[PDB]
A paper describes a structure:
Adenine at position 58 (A58) located in the T-loop is one of the most conserved nucleosides in tRNA, and the occurrence of 1-methyladenosine (m1A) at position 58 has been reported from all three kingdoms. In yeast, the two subunits complex TRM6-TRM61 has been identified as the key factor of this methyl transfer reaction. In this study, we report the crystal structures of S.cerevisiae TRM6-TRM61 holoenzyme and TRM6-TRM61 in complex with SAM. TRM6 and TRM61 adopt a similar fold, with a high structural similarity to the prokaryotic counterpart TrmI.
To improve understanding the target tRNA recognition and catalytic mechanism of the two component m1A58 tRNA methyl- transferase in eukaryotes, we solved the structure of the TRM6-TRM61 holoenzyme from S. cerevisiae by the SAD method using the Se anomalous signal. The final model has been refined to 2.2 Å resolution and the details of the data collection and refinement statistics are summarized in Table 1. One TRM6-TRM61 heterodimer adopts a rectangular shape with two arms protruding from the core. Previously, we have shown that a symmetric unit of the TRM6-TRM61 crystal contains one molecule of TRM6 and one molecule of TRM61, forming a 1:1 heterodimer. Further examination of symmetry- related molecules indicated that TRM6 and TRM61 form a 2:2 tetrameric heterocomplex, displaying a “Ω“ shape. The TRM6-TRM61 holoenzyme eluted with a molecular weight of approximately 219.5 kDa, which is very close to the theoretical value of 196.6 kDa for the TRM6-TRM61 heterotetramer.
Residue numbers in the entry:
A (entry chain A), B (entry chain A): -6 to 60, 80 to 86, 189 to 321, 326 to 451
C (entry chain B), D (entry chain B): 4 to 64, 70 to 88, 91 to 284, 332 to 376
Write the structure that this text describes.
Amino acid sequence: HHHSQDPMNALTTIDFNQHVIVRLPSKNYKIVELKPNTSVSLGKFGAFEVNDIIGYPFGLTFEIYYDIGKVRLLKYFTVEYLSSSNLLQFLIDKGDIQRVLDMSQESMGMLLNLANIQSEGNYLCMDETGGLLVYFLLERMFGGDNESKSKGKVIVIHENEHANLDLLKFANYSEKFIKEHVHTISLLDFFEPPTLQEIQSRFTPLPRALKGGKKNSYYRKLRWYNTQWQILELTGEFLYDGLVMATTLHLPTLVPKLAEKIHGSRPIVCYGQFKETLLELAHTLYSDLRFLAPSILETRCRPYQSIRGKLHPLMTMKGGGGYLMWCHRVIPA
Amino acid sequence: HHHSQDPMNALTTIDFNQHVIVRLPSKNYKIVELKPNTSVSLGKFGAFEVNDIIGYPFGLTFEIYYDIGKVRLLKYFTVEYLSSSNLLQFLIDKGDIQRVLDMSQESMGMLLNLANIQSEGNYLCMDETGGLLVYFLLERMFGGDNESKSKGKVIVIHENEHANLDLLKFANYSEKFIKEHVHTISLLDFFEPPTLQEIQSRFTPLPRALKGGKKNSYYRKLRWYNTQWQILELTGEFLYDGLVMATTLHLPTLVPKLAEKIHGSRPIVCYGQFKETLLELAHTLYSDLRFLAPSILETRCRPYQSIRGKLHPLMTMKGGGGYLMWCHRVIPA
Amino acid sequence: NCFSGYKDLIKEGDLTLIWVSRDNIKPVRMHSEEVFNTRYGSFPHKDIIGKPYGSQIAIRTFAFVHVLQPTPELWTLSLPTQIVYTPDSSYIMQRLNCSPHSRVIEAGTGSGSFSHAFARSVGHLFSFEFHHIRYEQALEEFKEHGLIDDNVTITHRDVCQGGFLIKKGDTTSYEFGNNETAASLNANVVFLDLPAPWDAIPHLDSVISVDEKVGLCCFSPCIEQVDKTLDVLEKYGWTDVEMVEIQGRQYESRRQMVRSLNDALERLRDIKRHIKEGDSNYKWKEVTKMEAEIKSHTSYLTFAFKVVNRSRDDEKVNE
Amino acid sequence: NCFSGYKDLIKEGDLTLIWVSRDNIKPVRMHSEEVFNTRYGSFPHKDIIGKPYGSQIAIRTFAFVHVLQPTPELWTLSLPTQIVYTPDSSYIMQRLNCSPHSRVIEAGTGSGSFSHAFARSVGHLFSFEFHHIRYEQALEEFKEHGLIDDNVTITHRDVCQGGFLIKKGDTTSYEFGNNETAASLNANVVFLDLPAPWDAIPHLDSVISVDEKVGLCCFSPCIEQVDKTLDVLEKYGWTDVEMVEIQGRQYESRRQMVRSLNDALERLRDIKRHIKEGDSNYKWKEVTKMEAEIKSHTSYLTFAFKVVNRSRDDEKVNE
């Protein structure tokens, strides 16, 4: 803002203070924060100055060479946008596959379309991964644009007092963006919300001219009050445009309760690492007329060694990738 | 035997009175019995005289042409040996996939090797398919040779009063061969066999010179007696060299009872159409120290359109193929 | 776009998807005087209009349908070759990171299956159709669905011979702005579903974004086609090239009867002395059952990326 | 052949496979003075010899092993490239209808994995090894296992340059009968695992059976190799040509904890006022879990068949 020149686009361009992906020659990923006037170490592959890569587009490979080395366009490294795909891959490389419930890129990609995820939708979500699912949703809805004019929201229902959304610290989202597009509510506040009466007995607002400590003790209470009021708005007769879930809670006695707040004709997608889990859910939903034709889906990707003359699928790879339970909320006659 | 010339080899050569496979231009199979001086109809693809194809090797394609047509080496048809593979494929073409419990060629091929099936082994078997599994076993052990000197046996344990082995009528096995290599025993006779005392009270043999009706009423009773004696030999302290199963009976409370008659270090292979079934069994066997490391295996075949210039996997095919539960009988310390 | 957003109530004139069964989904435009017929009965529209989307509709001699708002996934299942199904398309979109930031080139339009999935999330879609009659049909459909008035452009073009430029005078739905004589495609996402994608790739340099990573996916049924594609991609400077296949499966939730040894024994003891799935008179085990027929191959997916201006503004960084 | 038949009791001098864990199976020859060491303890052989095959053997400071009779499947799992695993090999054997009727040509011998599976069921096995040092090792192993004295022949040979004929004077285990100067291979089953199988296929006409359907499988990692194979097969008169791939998966039987909504609620109510798998203090759901790493590609399998004498004895049929 203090520059006369137009800002750099961090969606297209390597920019200061962005969290960014770096692919090493060994093909594993690192996440790197681009603090001005600092250096970054890649162990055996050398170190480089952050300033020397700013302003380039993503997808380029830089060589580190020595007369902390210098960088030129091509040991070496490749700099990529921190996409939902790349974040998942980083977590897998890091060894956290069980923390992401064994999910794959194709399974999450399918979940996004089965769930009909759109910029203007309000989606009900459970995410036990630390926010990876939330991030897949947000990146598809807004593309990482903190200035999006779209009004869509992800409402995260969670098991503990607070939601675990720690992965969003890598997302390059402003606090404003997050507050506008992500709402969190515990399972207890969602299924047994406080009444307006119960809320008011703790605080009712004043009819602005406050100052000092009085202004600050008041707005903290008013903050609590607005939180409570948000819960009222989200738990009333409010109806959501879809339900997406990656939780290890017991689905057969959880999903029917969540689906009462979903509008008719909206998709429901439950991700699960184990098909037997979804099988039990599908049978439970078969006998509930509020659910249309629950289906268990599986998608698996097999890459090829893609060099001309020696074309063949990869000979080994990791198993897993999980399964999707897809169905639609409907209204019985 | 009344020919001075050496007989034709029905393993290598199209021969009279053999059941044989015919592949039509539409690629579906028919089973054809080659009765001398008869004709065979293939509907829209014409009819031909059995005599005109005898003596050729298997694997040839014949054209039917007209001046009941004549045949020459190439509408058309291909004549193949009735192998265990081809019998399965015929049943699938015929639409009987559920009668064969959805099994595939690769799953049965794997079962044969996991079970270490050998010419001299005595194998315990359950087969609800009408004898397809029994036939896979017999063909691997003896190769269709009714004069094999090998001594191996398949002992079929079955649910009803008699075993359903009706598919063996297509097998081109003599009654002698079958009687020498296949024994049947009901579940009740296997788990609660009659005693020697109970058998003798109904019949004890005479010390040969009988004749007429006396010789014939005696040998019928002696036949019953020998059947009972065979059961005694197979249910005592007799131990088998392997257990192979394709049944839809409840496996967790059946397999431990069957495995008591299996020698230490012998494989156990249970085929199942549904993995959830085998999963339950594997957990049951985990806590029984008589079973070593039960594993659920899956094998799937994907053919390619194999024409040069347009190479790619088949675009559609049937799902299924089933699963194998593999483990070894062991002796706890 | 009647595929986009979230309608509450079914209105006269609305395009709906009426779910009859899993393999039977029909697109039906509501009209108060019309009737929807299935092999199970007749459903007058006036008994549907005014009810919420997702309503189960019942008639006696009871038969049912469910009336749904169109979505790309359900639309694709309703269609009767040139079809990209959801396992392939959702993967392609995820791997190329589709979002409102995306500007995509699609050729050819084919069934329009992929076009509807793109349109839902992309900033803009530029679709190209070779066949003049398929072009006209796709145009009329995209217009009726509301795609053309939102974020979709379709153009009649042999992209292998004539490239991707959109100029005034061309057969196209494109609405030219003030002082615009040509569209600036500025594509950062390219999907090619063509007989010979390697003839089209050379034309991409004129229409792709030049200051960002551009992603490309080529959709080809045969390995020989993949081989020719890998070759041209290398020649025209595309990197991070990788071919993959996607395999999708669907399972039914079913039950197998529990049949014990003891009951088989008891039946044999009796001999010695002388059904609908889920039936509560029996015990059942839950099992998953694979779809009868599987799509064991749709196409090989070849992904590639390009950056044209492999440079930075050195002095603008200095400031 | 110590892989064949069914031994009751473990004997001094027996080759055994000692199962330590799923990924740890070791071949061990029993000797009364020797000891078997694992990372869990020491197992003296004299405490094993004389016990039945399949015995669990226990020691305190309790640790266990299981002592098994060798089989081709367990042997293959015990081995440390050129390995054909059971999903591929069992399929190949089934599709080519292997039985005592089979006479097979295998080239190359590779790890000997396939050789042991063949030997168990075939009439005779003719195996060919290119490398003189691998030949000698395979020969010594096949001899020790008892294969050479049963139904297996191994020959040192570059089959692509010198073909498959076995003549007196050749480097081979083959035992020539009376008046035999050359083996009559008379092969009806051929398996080729070679860098360039298309150089070997032309030599097959001299050694395959001429009056029966001969089956061939070529094992090649790359699609380009498949393409060259399809070409030569056609030129040398092989028909019913089909390439397939086999995919094997293995699953663990596991359990996931059942965690109810109600218990999550009760935990949140408490907040408001202010573990080994299978643990019987909890509820569990049985689940299958895929092996951590999968063999997503071993090789393409190209099958083909030939009949040389495409004729019958017309007059012998007349009689």
